[PDB]
Ligand binder design. Structure first.
Ligand SMILES: CCCCCCCC(=O)O
Ligand SMILES: CCCCCCCC(=O)O
Ligand SMILES: [Fe+3]
Ligand SMILES: [Fe+3]
Ligand SMILES: [Fe+3]
Ligand SMILES: [Fe+3]
Lengths: 285, 285
């Protein structure tokens, strides 16, 4: 379908648009390159583990590698729908979003390669709840935007992607990585990568908050849709958390070897806390 | 539609894929930020011009600002179609492509703002041939990919976008900018921007060559489709070139003021040369 005009021919960028400002920050804070991370110490750490200590870390890496890959692919329909509404500054920012996610995919794949599990298929650690969110509901809600860009549809896409997948699960995964392996002194390259990912994620979540809030602001009834879509996904959120928890409670040789009181009750409550504070960043009014 | 698996969970990135290597180079060579360009000298240059010297430079800026904006929006369907075919490394690279184009839009808009023409609507310098390529045929060929990702459709999208819009028109515009204003000592910020754009453009054109060649390689008959779609667009290419040429031949006060023998016959032959060497970068075999 045709371009009727061009904003930067008729006028300029809206330099005060929040998403143009977030775009600017993304360029400033987005220079990191996963190709510069030194994973040589991670290779040695991983090889030094027992086979039982080795399994301990694979579930979380499985959940993240697919997370990053899903969101790299699944942001495209959001950029399309906003482009078609003429929201140029949103699109500018989203180019940084998509590129961040490509780096995230790259970072986890480089780690798997470097530690020697690239040839191992980690799909086994995706249980039914994980598959529901990442194999199904995330691509459903995003691909919807190709044919339905109603406020309802846009809110639901930003809820699943930015508020749940990123704002709840990814954020809790970053915390979990630090609580466990940063305590242990293991896997320094991977944790440098996690620190960069977590910084990028702040912008991703702010795009979701801005997107959701700008639609709530038009019609306070969309607040309820937001809460509702958060609650609809919680069962799968926690059911993946319990599944990982059981996996860790059954494989505790890395816990004992490195003197890590892995506090699953505290990881669980951090997930709960993430979920509820994402709610509280959307004002009904 | 659902993800069946994830390549970086089952395996890794194909680290030897040409588009993964181009992605890597894009990160290394893609750090420039239009927000760092100093346009203060451009503001003074532009204000020092006569009204007749002022008009001289606006057509080319009009053609480019819409070019960058069109290609920022219109690359999205290519990333989608390749994502859906599972071509992960292509997608990784294309995130750098889309972000480059956002910076290109940004660069021209910052110049217009800084020199004081942001509020002026430059659409008047888009004649009928330009509108056919950029308002119509480019978005048609790209949006097609949402519903038809046949080799025919992919070849035609890369021909219009990478080989014509970028590989022929943009490349000739860069040359034209240097031949004219770099000679004059005018507009140093803008020309720094053009140098960065031209570097980015090399990767864009190589994605198009790779994309077109990998389909030609399957079936040598697609070579003819390539040539044919190049020839179909040439009339509008040159008809925009003639239109700009007449505009410059009629407004030659900037030419005289800065002692610039503007050689339109040489700009024309450079456009012709670009068009033909893009053909010669696709091997029929
Ligand atoms: C203790 C397990 C809870 C952490 C959530 C991990 C989310 C993810 O890995 O994508
Ligand atoms: C002498 C005019 C020929 C240069 C082609 C300019 C292409 C563009 O401005 O997008
Ligand atoms: Fe990510
Ligand atoms: Fe993210
Ligand atoms: Fe460009
Ligand atoms: Fe380009």
């Amino acid at each position: 379908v045709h371009h009727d005009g061009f904003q930067t021919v008729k006028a300029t960028i809206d330099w005060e648009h929040p998403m143009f400002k977030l775009y600017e920050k993304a360029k400033r804070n987005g220079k990191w390159n996963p190709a510069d991370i030194d994973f040589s110490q991670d290779q040695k750490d991983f090889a030094s583990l027992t086979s039982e200590e080795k399994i301990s870390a694979l579930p979380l890496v499985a959940g993240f590698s697919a997370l990053e890959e899903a969101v790299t692919l699944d942001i495209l329909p959001m950029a399309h729908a906003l482009a078609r509404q003429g929201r140029l500054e949103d699109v500018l920012f989203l180019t940084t979003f998509m590129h961040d996610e490509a780096k995230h995919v790259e970072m986890f794949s480089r780690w798997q390669q470097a530690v020697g599990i690239g040839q191992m298929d980690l799909s086994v650690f995706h249980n039914d709840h994980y598959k529901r969110i990442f194999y199904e509901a995330l691509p459903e809600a995003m691909n919807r935007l190709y044919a339905d860009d109603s406020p309802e549809a846009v809110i639901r896409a930003a809820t699943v992607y930015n508020m749940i997948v990123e704002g709840t699960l990814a954020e809790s995964g970053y915390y979990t990585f630090r609580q466990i392996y940063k305590k242990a002194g293991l896997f320094p390259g991977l944790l440098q990568g996690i620190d960069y990912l977590n910084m990028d994620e702040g912008r991703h979540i702010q795009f979701g908050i801005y997107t959701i809030q700008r639609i709530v602001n038009e019609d306070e009834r969309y607040y309820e849709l937001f809460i509702r879509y958060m609650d609809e996904l919680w069962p799968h959120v926690i059911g993946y958390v319990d599944y990982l928890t059981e996996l860790g409670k059954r494989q505790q040789q890395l816990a004992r070897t490195y003197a890590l009181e892995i506090d699953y009750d505290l990881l669980r409550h951090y997930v709960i806390k993430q979920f509820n504070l994402r709610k509280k960043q959307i004002s009904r009014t």
